Structures are given as structure tokens and as C-alpha cells.
Amino acid sequence: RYYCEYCHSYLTHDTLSVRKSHLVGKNHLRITADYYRNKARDIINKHNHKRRHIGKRGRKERENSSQNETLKVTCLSNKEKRHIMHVKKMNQKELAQTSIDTLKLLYDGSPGYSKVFVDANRFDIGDLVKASKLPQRANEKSAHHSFKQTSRSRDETCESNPFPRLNNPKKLEPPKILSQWSNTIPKTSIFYSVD
């Protein structure tokens, strides 16, 4: 027989046509994704500190650091440190998730654009994206969304959109700044700009 260690469910006589159909089962995929997210979360979250090997401090070290001065240590209440740790965990996750993607937004009308940045017509990873689209054997999966697909073909040329300014363009977004240091910005710009 077979036993899906992640799934926790047995199975009958292990035939590759049964086993491979289990291994692309949607519920098995949810269980496996939960397992590996939790294990990576556990090895990130585990602060194992080095063991402390305290030696006996000498005399002259004791005179110097007894005659420096004493520093105040700051510490916070329980709800303060809980709220701060929630903030720190979401900030580390959005730094890990984000990525600068302005070279894609910035060449948006260029002549050979559909052959490089489309990501489905790329010659290296071209067949893989179409191949791994998935069956979608669910009618309501396609019947959920009612927007356009906007499949930009590889066969597009230079002739369409001859003048890029006249088709309505967007200005690039202003550079994002740190919110904790958002008060250190210069308060007035130089040139009077409207809208």
C-alpha cells in the first residue's frame, strides 16, 4: 500500500496511476503547502542562542567598568511588545515578498516588448508557462472572474501605437519613502506644480 505522510490518509495498492493522481490532488497540495510554510516558519522563528560561558572578570577590568557609569535599560510592557512584534513580522514579510519591478513598467511600449517581458512568449521558459497553466476542470473557476485576459501576442509589430504620448500614458509613481522617517522630508517643494 501507500501512505501520504503529509495527508495522513492511507491508500490501496500502490499503483503509479493512483499515486500520481493523489500527488496532484488539490487537497494534498493544500496540506503540503501548509506543512512546508509551517516548517520554514519554525526554523525562522526559533531563536537558539549560544550557550553562555561566563569567565571570572579580572581586577583592572572591574575597576574600569565600575568607574565608567551605569546606563539605563529600556523595557516595555506586555501589550507593547506584542504589538511591536506583530508590526516587525509583517514588515519582514513585506520586504521578503516585494520586488522592484520598474523595468517592466518602463519599457511598456517598446518595439520588441512582447518577445521578452510577456513571460509566456519567452524562448527559454516559453513552453513551460503554457504547459503548467493547469486543467481548470472547474467551470466555475473560469466563471468566477469577469475581466479581460489581455493576452499580448508575440506577432505584434512596431506599427501599432505609432505615437506613445497620444495614447494616454501614465507618469511614473513617486519614489516610496520610509513611513517612520516621513517627517524628515523637505516640507515645501521648489516649483509650483498643479494637480
Binding site: 577590568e61 567598568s65 546606563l71 522592484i100 520598474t102 524562448f123 527559454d124 508575440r154 519613502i177 522630508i185
Partner: protein, 272 residues
């Protein structure tokens, strides 16, 4: 009949080729001729007809000798030759692409390094290529992607974690379009430090002992002194943040807001 002979006896090929060979410096004829030859081999793989691969190579090479500032077609011709089996040719295609741009193009360095990560498999040589790309196209206003790619390779290969602090301190003084991400890396990485010996990763120990009045080898209670350390280094980073924020926001408000087109387009286009 095969794909090549069938393609030659087609009627469209004589028309597309005569329009290209009459009007060379009009781009849309070249791209129509090129899309037709590529569509005429509907599976492209290693077994397609060599008399037809030689013609796709002659078409791309002759177009790029006519219109040498077309960034996307160097990437596409190199990725075609990378599909066809030989990375040795695709190195040359990217490198003549960089040379026709006189080494100062951001997109060809970014695509050449995301290519070269896979195939160069020797660590000091790949890092010499990143140092070359740094000294040419490093100070680009949109080169956040290059530096973030470089930090990705440094944090995945190296075991020392000194080179990361070095490169990140050089990012901190460049006025990039998206420098706040490269400041948030530095902020959370200072905040993720644990003991006093690791403050010498940033600067030298005597620079700390003089400028910030902080001793690494202070042995004693090292809780409050480490918290004092993190607050003083965060203050210095706040001041350097003010300087880079001023320069970035000044360039953006005055000049870089107004340029809308950054690409070569075609010889028949007009700039506003």
C-alpha cells in the same frame, strides 16, 4: 515538402522580402519579415531544418546590424540561440549587444546577469561580471533591480556575510529611484544583530571608538550598551537617509518626472 521549401514557394515571402529590401530603415517591415519567418517554424527545437535556422540567424543579425540600439531584440536573439542548444553563441550575442550600447545599457546588463547566473557556474568569474556591470551601469536611476539581483547572489552564495554589509553600504549612498527598500534592509539588519562583536561588520572598530564613542570590547553588562549602540547607528543612518532622500526627491520632482519615453522605438519616430 518540408518547412523550408514550403516557406520559399510561399507567395508572402517574396513580398515581405522585397518590401524590406526596398525600404531598409523602416522598422515595421523588418518586424513583419521576422515574425513571418519565426511563425513559419511552428515548433522551434533542435531538429528543425538547418537551411531555415541559418536564415533566421541571418535575418536577426542583419536587422541588428541595421538598428543597433534595439534592446529587446538582442535579448530575444540570444534567448533563441539559448533555446537552440548553445550557450556559447548567446554569450556573444549579449556581449555585442552591450558593446553596441558602449556598455552603458541597464536592460542588457540585467538580462545578461539573469542569464549568466545559470550558466557560468564559477563564483569569482560571476562576481567579476557583477563588478563590471556595477562600474558601468551602477549609478543608473532605475538600477534598483541590478543591485537587488546582486545582493541576491551575494546572500545565496557567500558564507561570510561581510560582503553583504559592504555592498549594502555602497547602496546606501547612491540616489536610486527606490532607495527606501535598500534602507529597510539596512534597518532590519541592524535590528537583527545580536552581540557587540558584530558591530565591526559595518565599519572599523576604531571608527566606532572615535566617532560614536563606543567600545566593542566593553565587557560587562552588554544589554544596555548594545541598545545604545543600535540607537546611535540608527541615528547616523537617519542622517544619511535625509541626504539621499533630498537628492532623490529633487531629481524626481524636477527632471525624472517628465521623461515618459526611455526606449529606442524606431528611426521614424518623433520625440515630443
Amino acid at each position: 515538402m518540408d518547412k523550408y521549401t514550403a516557406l520559399i514557394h510561399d507567395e508572402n515571402f517574396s513580398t515581405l522580402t522585397l518590401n524590406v529590401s526596398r525600404y531598409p530603415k523602416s522598422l515595421a517591415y523588418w518586424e513583419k519579415l521576422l515574425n513571418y519567418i519565426v511563425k513559419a517554424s511552428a515548433p522551434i527545437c533542435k531538429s528543425t531544418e538547418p537551411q531555415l535556422l541559418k536564415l533566421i540567424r541571418c535575418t536577426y543579425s542583419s536587422m541588428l546590424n541595421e538598428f543597433p540600439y534595439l534592446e529587446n531584440y538582442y535579448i530575444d536573439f540570444a534567448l533563441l540561440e539559448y533555446k537552440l542548444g548553445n550557450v556559447s553563441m548567446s554569450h556573444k550575442i549579449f556581449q555585442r549587444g552591450l558593446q553596441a550600447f558602449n556598455q552603458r545599457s541597464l536592460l542588457l546588463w540585467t538580462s545578461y546577469l539573469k542569464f549568466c547566473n545559470n550558466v557560468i557556474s564559477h563564483q569569482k568569474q560571476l562576481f567579476k561580471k557583477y563588478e563590471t556591470a556595477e562600474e558601468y551601469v551602477g549609478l543608473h536611476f532605475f538600477s534598483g533591480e541590478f543591485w537587488d539581483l546582486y545582493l541576491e547572489q551575494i546572500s545565496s552564495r557567500c558564507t561570510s556575510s561581510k560582503k553583504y554589509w559592504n555592498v549594502l553600504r555602497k547602496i546606501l549612498e547612491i540616489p536610486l529611484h527606490s532607495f527606501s527598500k535598500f534602507y529597510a534592509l539596512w534597518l532590519q539588519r541592524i535590528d537583527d544583530i545580536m552581540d557587540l562583536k558584530q558591530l565591526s561588520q559595518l565599519t572599523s572598530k576604531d571608527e566606532l571608538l572615535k566617532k560614536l564613542k563606543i567600545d566593542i570590547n566593553y565587557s560587562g553588562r552588554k544589554g544596555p550598551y548594545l541598545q545604545d549602540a543600535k540607537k546611535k547607528l540608527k541615528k547616523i543612518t537617519k542622517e544619511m537617509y535625509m541626504v539621499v532622500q533630498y537628492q532623490v526627491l529633487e531629481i524626481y520632482s524636477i527632471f525624472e518626472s517628465k521623461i515618459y519615453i526611455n526606449y529606442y522605438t524606431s528611426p521614424e519616430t518623433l520625440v515630443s
